[PDB]
Design an enzyme around this catalytic site. Structure first.
Site, PDB file in Angstrom:
ATOM      1  N   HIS A 218       0.836  -1.193   0.000  1.00 34.99           N
ATOM      2  CA  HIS A 218       0.000   0.000   0.000  1.00 34.99           C
ATOM      3  C   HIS A 218       0.868   1.239   0.000  1.00 34.99           C
ATOM      4  O   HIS A 218       0.577   2.235  -0.679  1.00 34.99           O
ATOM      5  CB  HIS A 218      -0.891   0.087   1.241  1.00 34.99           C
ATOM      6  CG  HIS A 218      -1.847  -1.055   1.425  1.00 34.99           C
ATOM      7  ND1 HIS A 218      -1.705  -1.987   2.431  1.00 34.99           N
ATOM      8  CD2 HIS A 218      -2.990  -1.382   0.773  1.00 34.99           C
ATOM      9  CE1 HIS A 218      -2.714  -2.842   2.388  1.00 34.99           C
ATOM     10  NE2 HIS A 218      -3.497  -2.509   1.379  1.00 34.99           N
TER      11      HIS A 218
ATOM     12  N   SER B 192      -2.441  -7.998   3.209  1.00 37.92           N
ATOM     13  CA  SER B 192      -3.011  -7.796   4.553  1.00 37.92           C
ATOM     14  C   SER B 192      -3.405  -9.119   5.238  1.00 37.92           C
ATOM     15  O   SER B 192      -3.247  -9.281   6.448  1.00 37.92           O
ATOM     16  CB  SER B 192      -4.182  -6.811   4.520  1.00 37.92           C
ATOM     17  OG  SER B 192      -3.737  -5.500   4.191  1.00 37.92           O
TER      18      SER B 192
HETATM   19  N1  LIG Z   1       1.938  -6.385  -2.298  1.00 36.30           N
HETATM   20  C1  LIG Z   1       1.409  -5.380  -3.040  1.00 36.30           C
HETATM   21  N2  LIG Z   1       2.129  -4.690  -3.950  1.00 36.30           N
HETATM   22  C2  LIG Z   1       1.597  -3.692  -4.684  1.00 36.30           C
HETATM   23  N3  LIG Z   1       0.302  -3.301  -4.568  1.00 36.30           N
HETATM   24  C3  LIG Z   1      -0.538  -3.920  -3.693  1.00 36.30           C
HETATM   25  C4  LIG Z   1      -0.013  -5.016  -2.863  1.00 36.30           C
HETATM   26  N4  LIG Z   1      -1.016  -5.451  -2.082  1.00 36.30           N
HETATM   27  C5  LIG Z   1      -2.106  -4.694  -2.361  1.00 36.30           C
HETATM   28  N5  LIG Z   1      -1.817  -3.775  -3.316  1.00 36.30           N
HETATM   29  C6  LIG Z   1      -2.786  -2.836  -3.888  1.00 36.30           C
HETATM   30  O1  LIG Z   1      -3.302  -1.999  -2.872  1.00 36.30           O
HETATM   31  C7  LIG Z   1      -4.677  -1.659  -3.197  1.00 36.30           C
HETATM   32  C8  LIG Z   1      -5.527  -2.074  -2.033  1.00 36.30           C
HETATM   33  O2  LIG Z   1      -5.339  -3.452  -1.749  1.00 36.30           O
HETATM   34  P1  LIG Z   1      -6.244  -4.206  -0.627  1.00 36.30           P
HETATM   35  O3  LIG Z   1      -6.176  -3.236   0.552  1.00 36.30           O
HETATM   36  O4  LIG Z   1      -5.535  -5.516  -0.438  1.00 36.30           O
HETATM   37  O5  LIG Z   1      -7.615  -4.345  -1.217  1.00 36.30           O
HETATM   38  C9  LIG Z   1      -5.021  -2.405  -4.482  1.00 36.30           C
HETATM   39  O6  LIG Z   1      -4.795  -1.577  -5.642  1.00 36.30           O
HETATM   40  C10 LIG Z   1      -4.017  -3.551  -4.428  1.00 36.30           C
HETATM   41  O7  LIG Z   1      -3.772  -4.202  -5.647  1.00 36.30           O
END
Ligand SMILES: Nc1ncnc2c1ncn2[C@@H]1O[C@H](COP(=O)(O)O)[C@@H](O)[C@H]1O
Ligand SMILES: Nc1ncnc2c1ncn2[C@@H]1O[C@H](COP(=O)(O)O)[C@@H](O)[C@H]1O
Ligand code: PRO
Ligand code: PRO
Lengths: 262, 262
Positions: A37, A187
């Site tokens: 993030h 997460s």
């Molecule tokens: N390890 C990671 N590397 C790069 N971007 C990420 C990663 N994990 C989550 N994201 C991005 O962060 C945003 C929120 O992710 P989430 O909070 O998991 O729904 C989305 O655009 C995800 O694809």
């Protein structure tokens, strides 16, 4: 200085107070923030005058109730991280803010990329995700939207969404941040126990050794670690997979040529 | 002086040239303009500095192929009408303009009002309507939207759409314009033969004399004209109905206390 908007009314006020001249960047998330993030936030800070981050654990995109109930939650730590990064606005709405009358009108994806991989493995997930992203875009009205490449299908669906509903927002895709082992930051990985992490590391050693010419055999090598592979597929030039260790569901995608490289 | 914009680029041009001081009124239609449409246009004109009228026969909302094939088409006559009404912009896009990649992402209504009457009678109609309306609103970004009461469920659904996707547009509902008999004005009426017209008038001679205390006997009276009743129902204090005369499907709704008066 960070402004925290706990509800839509407050947010509208904040959003209406920005002049068209300011570049606005947006990073949607479900909280429990990690370096993945953070990389997205850092990119958005380098390119915008005003960066907004949302934290909203969207109920309509959880096809699994237990997944939902156990989704990691650490608002105070998250706020501390966002303030450390000098994020301008945190939007952290309630369910009733986003769905005043429940989930009555939904975006339904009818296309192949929705029907395979994550779409197949999580029925109703993409509808919920697309519906909440559309609403969050209508609320924040950003110039720039930052997304991780890790959720590859999500990226392509949101691109289609912005195209089809004439949303004047640019989409910036950011590379997947990984641990040294190659395991992508996620997460849900906070839910992994001690031994589970070692299992995850076993798997990524296997992946960094593999040429991906024999998916059945690689599947077998992955299942022996104790994890349970849900799916693995070679799609053009990219490998997509998802698997369970204990109760934790992990997903990944990467270039066939690179592997989950550093 | 009316600007005719037969595509998005052309429409963005004119739209983006308007100053914020100018109240924009929007009247979406599917062409083949009648006094029903004209009343909406007049209302918009009395209330706005800029009036936009769209004409787009949306394929995704026709559940019946024959209905789509025969839907009335008269662009030159429509253009003449709009010009004499001093309409500022005609937005007349092509299928490709509106659905660049086809009908891949759709608004799906999951609620009661969508499941009865017209929604049940026309499976998949409301999904088509809501998707194109969302697109049209995203393109035109009007201050005021004008809708006819005749399509009652449509109005309710569009109010829910505007609420759910945070569209800052006021909705103005307008009274159903009628023939002397009480028969609502409708584009599909142009497909009625002379004898069809007389059946339609007989139906409304019947409706005007009815108290609606017995829909069974009323259904029999309507069917005895040669029309085929689809449904007739009381919802709250209104009567809703739809019927075919030959291949032409017409609908109406009015207060039970008044009937289709005027
Ligand atoms: N390890 C990671 N590397 C790069 N971007 C990420 C990663 N994990 C989550 N994201 C991005 O962060 C945003 C929120 O992710 P989430 O909070 O998991 O729904 C989305 O655009 C995800 O694809
Ligand atoms: N007889 C009528 N009186 C008033 N409004 C109408 C009438 N017929 C259609 N409309 C409205 O005109 C708009 C376009 O209708 P249509 O072109 O039939 O899709 C919708 O808001 C309709 O409800
Ligand atoms: O649900 C879950 C979301 C989808 C993208 C990554 N996290
Ligand atoms: O037919 C069709 C559209 C739906 C509202 C009125 N006409």
């Amino acid at each position: 200085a960070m402004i925290i908007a706990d509800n839509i009314k407050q947010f509208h006020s904040i959003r209406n107070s920005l002049i068209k001249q300011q570049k606005i960047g947006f990073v949607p998330t479900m909280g429990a923030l990690h370096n993945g993030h953070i990389s997205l936030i850092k990119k958005a800070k380098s390119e915008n005058d005003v960066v907004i981050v949302s934290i909203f654990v969207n109920p309509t995109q959880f096809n699994n109730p237990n997944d939902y109930q156990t989704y990691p939650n650490q608002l105070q730590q998250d706020i501390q991280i966002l303030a450390s990064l000098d994020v301008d606005v945190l939007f952290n709405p309630s369910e009733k803010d986003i769905y005043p009358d429940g989930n009555l009108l939904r975006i339904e994806p009818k296309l192949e990329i929705a029907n395979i991989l994550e779409g197949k493995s999580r029925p109703g997930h993409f509808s919920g995700m697309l519906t909440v992203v559309l609403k969050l875009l209508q609320i924040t009205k950003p110039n720039n939207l930052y997304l991780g490449e890790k959720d590859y299908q999500q990226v392509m669906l949101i691109k289609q969404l912005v195209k089809d509903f004439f949303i004047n927002t640019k989409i910036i895709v950011c590379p997947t941040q990984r641990q040294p082992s190659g395991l992508p930051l996620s997460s849900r990985n906070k839910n992994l126990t001690s031994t589970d992490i070692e299992i995850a590391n076993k798997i990524y050693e296997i992946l960094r050794q593999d040429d991906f010419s024999n998916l059945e055999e690689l599947t077998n090598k992955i299942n022996s670690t104790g994890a349970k592979l849900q799916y693995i597929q070679k799609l053009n030039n990219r490998i997509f997979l998802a698997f369970y260790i204990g109760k934790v569901r992990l997903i990944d995608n990467f270039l066939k040529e690179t592997g989950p490289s550093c």
